[PDB]
Design a protein around this ligand. Structure first.
Ligand SMILES: [Ca+2]
Ligand SMILES: [Cl-]
Ligand SMILES: [Cu+2]
Ligand code: NA
Ligand code: NA
Length: 133
């Protein structure tokens, strides 16, 4: 139930040869899909920015999407507690210690960005991004 089983992917801190730009553009659509399942963040990025958008036509209460980052070990807990927190809390437990970064929940035609400190990540750790809707 909800989007997290399908709308998820890995996020990995790596030394990308030569550096990389410090953002990613990601979309969630009307078919419960993100347009990537693997994001790499370069070590030398001080901040990283995720720009989420929602193309198509369905409203937030039917096909709402957020982008939520946690350790892979913490994902299930965040999803469970987020689902229980409900639509009016953007399907996130308020102040959840396990959420490294998150956007708001968006419907069709909306956009949201989140920037976070890359020092909150560690090489070797498994991170997941996901929608908790
Ligand atoms: Ca935001
Ligand atoms: Cl659903
Ligand atoms: Cu979603
Ligand atoms: Na690099
Ligand atoms: Na980029």
């Amino acid at each position: 139930m909800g989007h997290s089983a399908l709308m998820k992917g890995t996020l990995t801190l790596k030394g990308i040869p030569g550096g990389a730009e410090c953002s990613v553009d990601i979309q969630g659509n009307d078919q419960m899909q993100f347009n990537t399942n693997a994001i790499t963040v370069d070590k030398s990025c001080k901040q990283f920015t995720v720009n989420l958008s929602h193309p198509g036509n369905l409203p937030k209460n039917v096909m709402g999407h957020n982008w939520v980052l946690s350790t892979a070990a913490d994902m299930q807990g965040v999803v469970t507690d987020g689902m229980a927190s409900g639509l009016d809390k953007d399907y996130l437990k308020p102040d959840d210690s396990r959420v490294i970064a998150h956007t708001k929940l968006i419907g069709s035609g909306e956009k949201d960005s989140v920037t976070f400190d890359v020092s909150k990540l560690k090489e070797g750790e498994q991170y997941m991004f996901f929608c908790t809707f």
